[PDB]
UniProtKB/Swiss-Prot annotation, chain A:
Coiled coil: none annotated. It is linked to Tubulointerstitial kidney disease, autosomal dominant 1: A form of autosomal dominant tubulointerstitial kidney disease, a genetically heterogeneous disorder characterized by slowly progressive loss of kidney function, bland urinary sediment, hyperuricemia, absent or mildly increased albuminuria, lack of severe hypertension during the early stages, and normal or small kidneys on ultrasound. The ZP domain mediates polymerization, leading to the formation of long filaments. The core of the filament consists of interlocked ZP domains which assemble into a helical structure. Each ZP domain consists of an N-terminal (ZP-N) and C-terminal (ZP-C) region connected by a flexible linker; the linker allows the ZP domain to wrap around the ZP-C subdomain of the preceding subunit. The heavily glycosylated N-terminal part of the protein (containing several EGF-like domains) forms branches which protrude from the core and are involved in pathogen capture. This is Uromodulin. Expressed in the tubular cells of the kidney. Most abundant protein in normal urine (at protein level). Synthesized exclusively in the kidney. Expressed exclusively by epithelial cells of the thick ascending limb of Henle's loop (TALH) and of distal convoluted tubule lumen. Residues 10-140 are annotated as: ZP-C. N-glycosylated. Other complex glycosylation sites may serve as binding sites for proteins from other bacteria inclduding K.pneumoniae, P.aeruginosa and S.mitis. Proteolytically cleaved at a conserved C-terminal proteolytic cleavage site to generate the secreted form found in urine. This cleavage is catalyzed by HPN. Disulfide bonds join 62-122, 83-138, 127-134. It comes from Homo sapiens (Human). Glycans are attached at residue 69. Residues 10-21 are annotated as: Internal hydrophobic patch (IHP). It is found in: Apical cell membrane; Basolateral cell membrane; Cell projection, Cilium membrane.
Swiss-Prot record, chain B:
It comes from the Eukaryota. N-glycosylated. N-glycan heterogeneity at Asn-60: Hex7HexNAc6 (major) and dHex1Hex7HexNAc6 (minor); at Asn-150: dHex1Hex6HexNAc5 (minor), dHex1Hex7HexNAc6 (major) and dHex1Hex8HexNAc7 (minor); at Asn-224: Hex6HexNAc5 (major), dHex1Hex6HexNAc5 (minor) and Hex7HexNAc6 (minor). Glycosylated Asn-60 interacts with E.coli adhesin fimH. Other complex glycosylation sites may serve as binding sites for proteins from other bacteria inclduding K.pneumoniae, P.aeruginosa and S.mitis. The ZP domain mediates polymerization, leading to the formation of long filaments. The core of the filament consists of interlocked ZP domains which assemble into a helical structure. Each ZP domain consists of an N-terminal (ZP-N) and C-terminal (ZP-C) region connected by a flexible linker; the linker allows the ZP domain to wrap around the ZP-C subdomain of the preceding subunit. The heavily glycosylated N-terminal part of the protein (containing several EGF-like domains) forms branches which protrude from the core and are involved in pathogen capture. This is Uromodulin. Disulfide bonds join 2-95, 23-110, 45-83, 51-115, 76-84, 125-134, 128-143, 145-175, 163-253, 194-217. Changing residue 263 to S: Impairs polymerization and filament formation of the secreted form. It is linked to Tubulointerstitial kidney disease, autosomal dominant 1: A form of autosomal dominant tubulointerstitial kidney disease, a genetically heterogeneous disorder characterized by slowly progressive loss of kidney function, bland urinary sediment, hyperuricemia, absent or mildly increased albuminuria, lack of severe hypertension during the early stages, and normal or small kidneys on ultrasound. It comes from Homo sapiens. Residues 1-119 are annotated as: D10C. Changing residue 64 to R: In ADTKD1; results in defective trafficking of mutant protein to the plasma membrane; the mutant is retained in the ER. Changing residue 175 to G: In ADTKD1; causes a delay in protein export to the plasma membrane due to a longer retention time in the ER. Glycans are attached at residues 60, 103, 150, 224. The gene is UMOD.
Amino acid sequence: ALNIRVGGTGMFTVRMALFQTPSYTQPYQGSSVTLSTEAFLYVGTMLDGGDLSRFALLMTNCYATPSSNATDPLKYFIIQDRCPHTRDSTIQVVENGESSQGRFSVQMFRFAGNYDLVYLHCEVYLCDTMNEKCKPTCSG
Amino acid sequence: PCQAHRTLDEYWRSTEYGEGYACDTDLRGWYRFVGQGGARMAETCVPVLRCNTAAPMWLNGTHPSSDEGIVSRKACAHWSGHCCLWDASVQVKACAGGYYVYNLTAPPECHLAYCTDPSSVEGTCEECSIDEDCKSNNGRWHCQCKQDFNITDISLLEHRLECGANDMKVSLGKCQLKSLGFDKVFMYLSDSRCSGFNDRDNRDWVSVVTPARDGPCGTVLTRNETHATYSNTLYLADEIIIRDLNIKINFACSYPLDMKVSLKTALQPMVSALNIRVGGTGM
Ligand SMILES: *[C@@H]1O[C@H](CO)[C@@H](O[C@@H]2O[C@H](CO)[C@@H](O[C@@H]3O[C@H](CO)[C@@H](O)[C@H](O[C@H]4O[C@H](CO)[C@@H](O)[C@H](O)[C@@H]4O)[C@@H]3O)[C@H](O)[C@H]2NC(C)=O)[C@H](O)[C@H]1NC(C)=O
Ligand SMILES: *[C@@H]1O[C@H](CO)[C@@H](O[C@@H]2O[C@H](CO)[C@@H](O)[C@H](O)[C@H]2NC(C)=O)[C@H](O)[C@H]1NC(C)=O
Ligand SMILES: *[C@@H]1O[C@H](CO)[C@@H](O[C@@H]2O[C@H](CO)[C@@H](O)[C@H](O)[C@H]2NC(C)=O)[C@H](O)[C@H]1NC(C)=O
Ligand SMILES: *[C@@H]1O[C@H](CO)[C@@H](O)[C@H](O)[C@H]1NC(C)=O
């Protein structure tokens, strides 16, 4: 018998969209959205890669930066260490690690300074829904 | 030869034509038979009183295949009840493409003329792929690949693994496997239900597709703290049963567990702004 050993690397498709309405029904297509600060924000993250049965979309950390650059030193974390932020009451999460979609809502804001644009950047970590317990329960 | 010839567009040279009296004494040079009559001369001595001739002729033997050059033939003539009673000298030459040329000579006497069978207008050349040259074997056109595509051993085999987000596929050049000596190949995963098929994106490929999960075609998943890998093995054989040189394609592609994601839509807030203006002066 002859064994040839070959391999490869693949990527999974995870998406993020702005919801035009609460309860996360319709997505947003426009290139720049113009709201008031008092208004809230409806966002969700989709998972389109595969094996949604064995995997659960789970949010580890997310933040806001004034620029498209994600590594901006000025970061307003919206989720800290798998936890919705406690010091700000207007932050709420609906599902995290529960299913293949992660969503959350928060009041809109503006970065203090000569900054007129806000960008949102999150980082996801998939998990095994049987091998490890993916429910994040956070308390101060 | 292939470029300097005179075409012949006539529909009465079929071996189905009833009867005529024309004879070809003024035919001099290289000719191509094109149209409803056919592209090749008759290969068997068609019975007498056919194809607009009292005594039909026929180029005896077999049509030369591609890359044969000048071939000398002695076209026979069917008359009086004896096939090949009179003889004429012809020089048939094959050409690139589904057509031929001949050195049509003057028969010894009139009431003699050539005529063509339907031949293989059904047998086409476009069915050969881009790396498959339009070669012929004893007059039948086939798709023989590049000669430079000649690999002997097994380790040098090409393998195109695409680790798609939802499915996984592995692709191998059909020309390479034909060169390796396998007329037909058998793709089989851990389960034989995942038999391979053909697909073309830039050439002839045989490919297998397996969903990226745990068990859809017996694929095994072993996830460590950083990556999750899908491992399955492919089996190569040239017949249903193997007798030597077992082949096992140990392929596996893994996915990351962490990734970065952001909106593609710009956000712009407006907040109530109070502007207090002050001033000063200095030296
Ligand atoms: C968790 O599992 C993952 C998935 O297997 C694993 O990542 C693997 O790390 C090993 C160790 O480095 C890689 O092994 C390969 O081994 C040979 C050299 O010995 C080479 O094929 C590889 O180097 C290649 O690196 C790049 C890959 O294209 C290229 O620059 C080039 O081809 C190099 O040759 C590599 O060292 C193995 O490839 C990765 N798997 C990947 C990258 O998908 C990880 O280490 C595991 N974590 C653990 C065990 O803690
Ligand atoms: C994103 O932001 C960083 C920080 O402003 C940009 O500059 C890099 O900064 C790091 C330290 O934060 C330095 O080590 C690098 O040398 C800097 N340059 C690069 C090219 O990384 C960085 O360029 C920005 N990235 C993009 C794509 O705009
Ligand atoms: C077909 O091919 C032959 C050989 O190339 C052509 O020339 C004939 O060659 C023979 C053998 O030397 C001579 O005896 C003949 O006299 C040549 N014929 C002529 C007309 O010069 C021949 O011409 C070709 N036939 C046709 C019809 O094109
Ligand atoms: C014509 O072909 C037949 C069939 O093989 C053969 O018997 C005959 O001898 C051939 N004629 C000539 C002149 O070679």
